[PDB]
């Protein structure tokens, strides 16, 4: 009676209490103090209220399961519809509205039609923080902001991940490739699954480009989910000396203006020899030139370095595969890899000429 | 897109259950037919507290102020502080944080700053001794409300450090198919910026009402001296009844004001407590909301808790209607099979809740 009254939701709650016989106010409703005084002058109404480990865990969970059964043994449309509903092995029809045309048009019964129920978390989007790994049999290394198709829960979706490292647990700063044989972190805009769920990732899902190699590229688990990530990409500012004394030097071009040097005063720099230093004051007439002080006398063949950190953003890109809405259901094509784009529009790969290593030979070091 | 509610009732419970469930809601007609219509300042600052606690949740107040749009986000916690207004004490803002408190990335270390007590709200001793043990046996183990200083109304000036530091996955399934035997009955009588004899007058009034029941009565006494007393005179009394074999508790509090006799207030809170014992069964009339909220966000099992006839009310069933309105779950009230009293046993099958914000 009372449950039907509670969940019959076209009648007022005081009408439920009336035909059975507001929460900003925290403390509940009491009588008048005089009525309560004459009511509780007596006391006798409430005087009777006053006065192995593995098998143990399995026993606790089977105790909960028998509690589940013996409390399910109740009203038939209560159990079998609304208090739990359709346990397992129930044969159901399930109707979806606004299913696309292409499914019904191109429905080929070879390809299975699987459906899975999303949790409250898995309908949310945002940055998923994983730790992943180039799969040991995938040949080529992976690159940040190259798409790969993830299989994260029920969904398969192509995303743009960016591989990070917490370099001795200080930053979470941005790599440019995945490592060769171990795990890195990663962050991709996608549907937020729960933490500790595993996933695969694939470069190429089609069959025209299926090649001869191994097709699954990345493996990993999900570490954390969030709405925002704060990851950084190191930028150094390089400048050269042009007037050197003992223990101090005038540094030429890492800044364009004395306002910029004023913005950066007191910062610690270093040469490539590891000589630590500090910038002290902007010089007046040559504009980006400043005066720095070092540990000792630096040389004219050095480069000073201001290690700073620039924030980088994940790219909010997400397309699910929708392979069953195609006329071929293989041959799904998404965003291409960067080498594929360069091969398509014939751009040469970017080569900084002074980034290439050489064979340095030391001259012998003699002093006066 | 939005689950729609009407009126400014149960406002904190609606925003709290929307944050738990992750469902976008609208609350329409916030006192629209009124002389100063719209949201009030204390519930606007509660929205600011929700934006402090969560991250990525967008709240969208209208022009007229009479409808709010809450699209929730991830509970992240962190350390914060909240300078809540004089319209409501710190209990009005620390009560709805005890639901969101164990389900965040980083542990709750917030300190609220304002009035400590009110007639129609939760106190420090209320929050602590009543509402922390039901969480303590629903699954959390490290939760603490500290008073650094307390401020009686109207000027207040008291700070309260809510720290929860057990980030559980989900609350356990409750099984309370008994009425817990009350082992002791204790309490705390506090007074700030007044004479220390008022506390003993309150204690003597409460215990002369309590003296005829054959249990053991113990009321602790604190006067607050110095900067810890706050900016205003005040005094109040909070009794709990303590079932020690399981840990259950039933509380009742109030505060005195300008013209109030302390023996009168002590005996009033004592009789109000005994009536809560009468109208209580394994919970209190005010511990019952978050008890059944933790039962409904437990595991995907059946959890059952005994309640009595008089705990059913318009507040309790409007709570149940809001629960079913947000995440589509029903309670099943089965009666006990013995007939010297009218007690139901509410079985709730909890939704499949986990906290997905805590990093693994």
């Amino acid at each position: 009676n009372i449950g039907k009254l509670i969940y019959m939701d076209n009648i007022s709650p005081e009408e439920c209490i009336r035909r059975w016989r507001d929460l900003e106010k925290f403390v509940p409703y009491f009588d008048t103090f005089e009525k309560l005084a004459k009511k509780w002058k007596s006391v006798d109404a409430i005087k009777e209220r006053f006065l192995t480990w593995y098998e143990l865990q399995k026993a606790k969970i089977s105790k909960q399961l028998e509690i589940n059964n013996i409390e399910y043994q109740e009203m038939t449309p209560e159990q079998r519809q609304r208090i739990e509903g359709f346990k397992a092995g129930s044969y159901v029809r399930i109707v979806f509205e606004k299913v696309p045309m292409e499914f019904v048009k191109n429905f080929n019964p070879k390809f299975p039609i699987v459906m899975g129920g999303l949790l409250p978390t898995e309908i949310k989007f945002g940055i998923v923080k994983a730790r992943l790994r180039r799969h040991r049999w995938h040949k080529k290394i992976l690159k940040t902001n190259d798409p790969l198709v993830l299989s994260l829960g029920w969904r398969r979706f192509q995303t743009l991940p960016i591989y990070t490292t917490t370099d001795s647990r200080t930053r979470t700063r941005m790599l440019k490739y995945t490592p060769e044989h171990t795990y890195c972190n990663a962050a991709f805009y996608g549907p937020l699954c729960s933490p500790n769920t595993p996933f695969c990732g694939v470069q190429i899902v089609a069959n025209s480009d299926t090649g001869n190699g191994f097709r699954i590229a990345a493996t990993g688990i999900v570490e954390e989910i969030d709405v925002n990530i704060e990851i950084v990409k190191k930028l150094k500012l390089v400048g050269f000396p042009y007037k050197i004394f003992k223990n101090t030097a005038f540094i030429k071009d890492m800044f364009s203006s004395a306002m910029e040097v004023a913005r950066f005063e007191g910062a610690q720099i270093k040469t490539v020899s590891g000589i630590r230093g500090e910038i002290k004051r902007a010089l007046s007439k040559p504009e980006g030139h400043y005066r720095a002080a070092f540990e000792d006398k630096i040389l004219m063949s050095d480069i000073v370095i201001l290690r700073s950190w620039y924030p980088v953003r994940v790219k909010k890109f997400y397309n699910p595969v929708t392979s069953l809405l195609l006329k071929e259901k293989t041959e799904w094509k998404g965003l291409r890899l960067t080498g594929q784009i360069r091969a398509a529009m014939n751009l040469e790969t970017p080569s900084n000429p002074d980034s290439a290593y050489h064979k340095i030979e030391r001259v012998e070091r003699h002093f006066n | 897109k939005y689950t729609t509610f009407q009126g400014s009732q149960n406002f904190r419970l609606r925003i709290v259950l929307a944050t738990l469930s992750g469902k976008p809601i609208k609350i329409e007609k916030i006192r629209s037919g009124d002389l100063n219509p719209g949201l009030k300042d204390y519930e606007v600052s509660f929205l600011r507290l929700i934006e402090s606690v969560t991250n990525g949740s967008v709240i969208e107040i209208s022009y007229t102020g009479t409808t709010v749009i809450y699209r929730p986000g991830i509970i992240v916690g962190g350390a914060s502080t909240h300078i809540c207004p004089s319209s409501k004490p710190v209990g009005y803002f620390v009560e709805p944080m005890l639901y969101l408190a164990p389900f965040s990335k980083k542990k709750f270390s917030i300190l609220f700053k304002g009035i400590t007590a009110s007639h129609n709200d939760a106190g420090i001793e209320a929050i602590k001794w009543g509402l922390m043990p039901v969480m303590e046996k629903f699954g959390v183990r490290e939760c603490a409300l500290h008073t650094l200083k307390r401020g009686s109304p109207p000027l207040g000036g008291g700070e309260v450090h809510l720290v929860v530091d057990s980030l559980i996955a989900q609350p356990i399934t409750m099984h309370e198919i008994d009425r817990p035997i009350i082992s002791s009955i204790t309490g705390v009588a506090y007074s700030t910026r007044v004479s220390p004899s008022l506390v003993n007058r309150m204690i003597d009034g409460a215990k002369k009402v309590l003296k005829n029941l054959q249990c053991e009565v113990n009321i602790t006494a604190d006067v607050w001296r110095g900067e810890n007393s706050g900016k205003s005179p005040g005094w109040g009394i909070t009794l709990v009844a303590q079932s020690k074999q399981k840990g259950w508790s039933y509380f009742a509090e109030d505060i005195g004001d300008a013209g109030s006799i302390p023996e009168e207030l002590g005996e009033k809170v004592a009789c109000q407590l005994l009536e809560e014992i009468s109208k209580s069964a394994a919970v209190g009339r005010n511990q019952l909301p978050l008890a059944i909220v933790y039962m409904v966000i437990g595991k995907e099992d059946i959890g059952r808790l005994r309640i009595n006839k008089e705990q059913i009310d318009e507040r309790f069933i409007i709570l149940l209607r809001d629960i079913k309105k947000i995440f589509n779950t029903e309670v099943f009230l089965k009666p006990v099979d013995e007939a010297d009293n009218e007690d139901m046993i509410a079985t709730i099958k909890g939704i499949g809740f986990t906290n997905t914000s805590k990093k693994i």
Partner: peptide
């Protein structure tokens, strides 16, 4: 420092 890693905000149109 309070703004630095937020993503929400109340939208007070009053």
């Amino acid at each position: 420092k309070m703004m630095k890693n937020k993503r929400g905000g109340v939208i007070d149109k009053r």
